[PDB]
């Protein structure tokens, strides 16, 4: 199956409360394995998975320096971007960075990512060819020109295609008991009366990994999409995920509504019915 | 500045069975900025020992957090999640439904 590694960096400025808040987290497809918080009691990269802990002290001493370097740049980027948009230091602002790589089922490189955001909107992003950038406005083009001279696109392409991928494979092998295992969802339905002539069929899916899943309600084969309550895939707190879909079925028609569940852990897509 | 309203989901890690310990989850997602107050309520009172996950965001740069606490539900205790954000005038409270 396909995999991916992605790191997430959030820097929120505190005007009167001192240095900006910096949070860094790293994932493997849905599994957080590292964290860093500038306000945490530990100023080192802390592990969140058992398979990342088998790395020697040289790994953590290195990843601590790198994550401290990201915080220093975001601390500077906050002031730089504040000047680009001629903004006052009277308020707080948000700088978010995300980068990583995707691999296909053959574990070959599939796509690379490197993106910035300022105050919740896209600021600059590395394009698919891993050679050019996308600059939103003049402030972003200033950054684009600065990164072109520094040869930043070339450094990422060597990392996204060569290091992000190679170390993803190392993480997969070290956590094959966890990351390469697929836990199929446990499906069930619930029936609840809402009126004298209407009822609520809620199609459930719990304890599955990864979080990619698809819940669909059909009526006589037609996809019920406009009238179908769907909730965002939520975490359970132990590593698995949950999701449910609901439709308001008139009394007596429950027999012609069908729920469809698609997931990587299912050999064939499930078709659930009431009665 | 861009502001996005948080989406709230109150639920439990395991199917609620009165008398057995479980985890009460409140998953706030799709909001911006990250400054947000999330408290878990038991019969209207705030629960003290409440832990949260690490801050992360989605494809569209919207953050998400999971606030959880260990509890033991009963047939009479009512639980709710109170979330206050810059996009909400009055703090929103979502009661815990056993079937949602």
């Amino acid at each position: 199956g396909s995999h991916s590694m992605r790191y997430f960096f959030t820097s929120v400025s505190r005007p009167g409360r001192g240095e900006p808040r910096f949070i860094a987290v790293g994932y493997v497809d849905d599994t957080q394995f590292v964290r860093f918080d500038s306000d945490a009691a530990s100023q080192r990269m802390e592990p969140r998975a058992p398979w990342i802990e088998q790395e020697g002290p040289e790994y953590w001493d290195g990843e601590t320096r790198k994550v401290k370097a990201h915080s220093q740049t975001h601390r500077v980027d906050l002031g730089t971007l504040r000047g680009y948009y001629n903004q006052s230091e009277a308020g707080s602002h948000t700088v978010q960075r995300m980068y990583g790589c995707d691999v296909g089922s053959d574990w070959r490189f599939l796509r690379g990512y490197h993106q910035y955001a300022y105050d919740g909107k896209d600021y600059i992003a590395l394009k698919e060819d891993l050679r050019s950038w996308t600059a939103a406005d003049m402030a972003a083009q200033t950054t684009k020109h600065k990164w072109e001279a520094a040869h930043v696109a070339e450094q990422l392409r060597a990392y996204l295609e060569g290091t992000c991928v190679e170390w993803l494979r190392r993480y997969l092998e070290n956590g094959k008991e966890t990351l390469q295992r697929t836990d199929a969802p446990k499906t069930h339905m619930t029936h609840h009366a809402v009126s004298d002539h209407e009822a609520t069929l809620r199609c459930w899916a719990l304890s599955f990994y990864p979080a990619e899943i698809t819940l669909t309600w059909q009526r006589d084969g037609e996809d019920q999409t406009q009238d179908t309550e769907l909730v965002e895939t939520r975490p359970a707190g132990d590593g698995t995920f949950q999701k449910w879909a609901a439709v308001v079925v008139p009394s007596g028609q429950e027999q012609r509504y069908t729920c469809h569940v698609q997931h990587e852990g299912l050999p064939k897509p499930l078709t659930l019915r009431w009665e | 500045m861009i502001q996005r309203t948080p989406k709230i989901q109150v639920y439990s890690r395991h199917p609620a069975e009165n008398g057995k310990s479980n985890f009460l989850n409140c998953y706030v997602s799709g909001f911006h900025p990250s400054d947000i107050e999330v408290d878990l309520l038991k019969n209207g009172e705030r629960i003290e020992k409440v832990e949260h996950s690490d801050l992360s965001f989605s494809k569209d740069w919207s953050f998400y957090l999971l606030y959880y606490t260990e509890f033991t539900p009963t047939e009479k205790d009512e639980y709710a999640c109170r979330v206050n954000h810059v996009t909400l005038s009055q703090p929103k409270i979502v009661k815990w439904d056993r079937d949602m």
Partner: T-cell receptor
Amino acid sequence: EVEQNSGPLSVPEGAIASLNCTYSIRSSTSFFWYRQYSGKSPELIMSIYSNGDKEDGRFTAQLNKASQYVSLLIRDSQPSDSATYLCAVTTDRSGKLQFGAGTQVVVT
Amino acid sequence: GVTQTPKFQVLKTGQSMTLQCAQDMNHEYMAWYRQDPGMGLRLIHYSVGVGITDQGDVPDGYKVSRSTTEDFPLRLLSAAPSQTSVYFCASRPGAAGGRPELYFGPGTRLTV
């Protein structure tokens, strides 16, 4: 790896039996206490997940993720508590439960 | 909830018996542990589903089969003096997503 006392802890009747275990995997999330009488099977008596203390009956389990050690306190030790107590630790989304050597308690 | 067949069974050196285990709780995860004075419960093998076996901490010298959700028997190829231990069987509702508490069987004392 889970290290325990690995020795008979003699606690008089009515005292507080205190045994502890240390785990190696820092990212562990679930911690359990199993008691096992001589010849019988281990049964789950206490499970703690959040950093702090948790009491249920005469049993009290403490968790300290900073020092990476779990302890268990037995208030009002009785001869019915004389058994080997096993400490089990696990990580998220995993079925490999790591059990310690066990600490035998002999209450008179 | 969990039952094991060979209560207090003695074996020989060559081509010994195979210990059986079963549970009527429709559990996905099942495991075999070994208990020795001074070492504790040591994982032999575990299965997270039907036809899905995996090796634990001491897989050298053991073969396990998982053909049904209920039965999870532990086989012994050839008995060694190191096989003298008490074999326990455990299970839990699922490999993940459920309550991680483990249910143990009555056990099996064995000497060589």
